[PDB]
Design a protein around this ligand. Structure first.
Ligand SMILES: [Mn+2]
Ligand SMILES: [Mn+2]
Ligand SMILES: [Mn+2]
Ligand SMILES: [Mn+2]
Lengths: 198, 198, 198, 198
């Protein structure tokens, strides 16, 4: 049974960059629904798989990827943020960023561009390409998870679904992106990065 | 030059089913952007087409479908709503609905189901199938327009992008759907339906 | 465990409409491969599901749908064909056709055009819409199965992947479509129809 | 007006790696058809664009991308092959390869696996990422062109549609991939590389 993880901080801990109403709804409503729906979906799948019902298994893919991806993305997202975030990463992560994107500011502009560029619902990601052994930026549609659909290891994710910012930033997604850089938990991003150094 | 059409009513004309803040932003911000971006896109396309640059034409498809679809959908959407909407359609349209969906209430449940079922951004539609000569319900992803991607003639569209209801209904999309039935302009839907009787 | 079914006739039984080489290859190589890969993917999914590994389950989706769909489609396809086939169906099925498509010839035209219209690999299908209670034609990309992705019940399928006709008809897919009508097992299509119209 | 280019060699010049029948069919039938349909679609788009008919422009997208992409891909493909080809590239290109893929053999392995991995119709490509300033391998579905959909500059393409190898290698796509390495025109791949690495 997958479960809803607690936030590492309070709902208003990220004010004024992301207000508490958004954090409260995003976590307790959106994330909560994905976990429960994901559990329901896996259950149906085990039955379909047990019976060898290929048609059912295929019909259940949209729900599994959507709710499963919803669970994966937000679980990472919460840890990607922090009341004491912002600033810049250090050591290896920072050097990697400089190496792969020219500079930290150029990196931010690129991830921002990818996130702002998403048409409809989706996510912007800073991931690690194990095969090439370098950082890479990618955008994912709807709730599709990064690793499961591209193979890249997620390091930092920027949720650009409208529910992630509309109450506060309305249609101006760029304002949301500008603000979120202030709460990025580079300590966590660094840990995820070092995890791929093994 | 395509242009932003005026609303057939005031921004607060649909209260309390869809508040004025949503109508104001949806029209003056979201729709406005699509028109302007659509004009910019067509311009680039004419240049690419004139030069026979197939690569550019293909690279411009996402922007053209997205902004073009955005313009088409909202233009129809505004006319699909009315302060004096609600109730049920009559004559041929109503009979068609009964014939194709059992009853008007069954129809509403089906269009509601399709709209609520959209994962991510999108639209729910009541369209007309010219080939089969009957009504049909379809859901479209992101800003993809109904006729351009399915061939069906749009009659009634229900926007389920989060910007269409989040400020007022938050994550509870079903509340938004319940409410919108009160402002549906069946006079306009009927006119669009009769237009296919030719 | 899924298994490759025996063909219900000799590899050269559909001559000269679909030659023996194609039939033998199509069955012993193409269908056989889908079965083996299907069984491999399902086993991996069983492990992923047991571990609650959502990322793995999602990554396995393309292979599960491709091979599973391949198995589903070809299994139906073989029964849809017969050496003593051809001609036209009778009774209710024929009535439903003329009713839903105008006439048999118009039906042939519609299905043929859907099949010839497939860009890349895919299938054309005559299915049954249990919701609307009527026949419906649809086309599916690559190996995507009809029911698992559209909800329609498969009645008659026409494989338009190039391996299904290239050796004999080369690039002329229309000649292939014209020929196949001579071996359609209308008795089997009738069974499938009456089976879901209970 | 787009035109079908002449092959830079005899139809049987790539024997026995890719036989004459395939070459002649591939060029005079498949590529020729893409050109004609491309010219038809573009003209229709010119009319739609002139009328500000967004619905028509969007409906024409599938045909424009399919035939336009078909033209782009095959035009490049012919130049990528040569009767006196094979072996390994030299200078900077060879340096970039060993650098971005470990070695030439690892590169062959990577491109081969990407090409053999295509489910349905598609292409495997060795391209150049101008943004990252390095080589990159990618696979495109159906006739979708590399640059128009990924932004990568095409250097070497491997057509894995079944019409590109079925007559000779049947279902064994890997044998086809192994053989094609003998006719790769590394001189042309080098030109494309140096052309975008200015
Ligand atoms: Mn979210
Ligand atoms: Mn909208
Ligand atoms: Mn087949
Ligand atoms: Mn080809």
């Amino acid at each position: 049974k997958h479960s809803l993880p607690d936030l590492p901080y309070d709902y208003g801990a990220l004010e004024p960059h992301i207000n508490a109403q958004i954090m409260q709804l995003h976590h307790s409503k959106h994330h909560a629904a994905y976990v429960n729906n994901l559990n329901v979906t896996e259950e149906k799948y085990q039955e379909a798989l047990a019976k060898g019902d290929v048609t059912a298994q295929i019909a259940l893919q949209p729900a599994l990827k959507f709710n499963g991806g919803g669970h994966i993305n937000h679980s990472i997202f919460w840890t990607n943020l922090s009341p004491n975030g912002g600033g810049e990463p250090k050591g290896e992560l920072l050097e990697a960023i400089k190496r792969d994107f020219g500079s930290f500011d150029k990196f931010k502009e690129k991830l921002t561009a990818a996130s702002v560029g998403v048409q409809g619902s989706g996510w912007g990601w800073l991931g690690f390409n194990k095969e090439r052994g370098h950082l890479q930026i990618a955008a994912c549609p709807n709730a599709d998870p990064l690793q499961g659909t591209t193979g890249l290891i997620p390091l930092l994710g920027i949720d650009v679904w409208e529910h992630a910012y509309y109450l506060q930033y309305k249609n101006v997604r760029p304002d949301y992106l500008k603000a979120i850089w202030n709460v990025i938990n580079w300590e966590n991003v660094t840990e995820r990065y070092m995890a791929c150094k093994k």
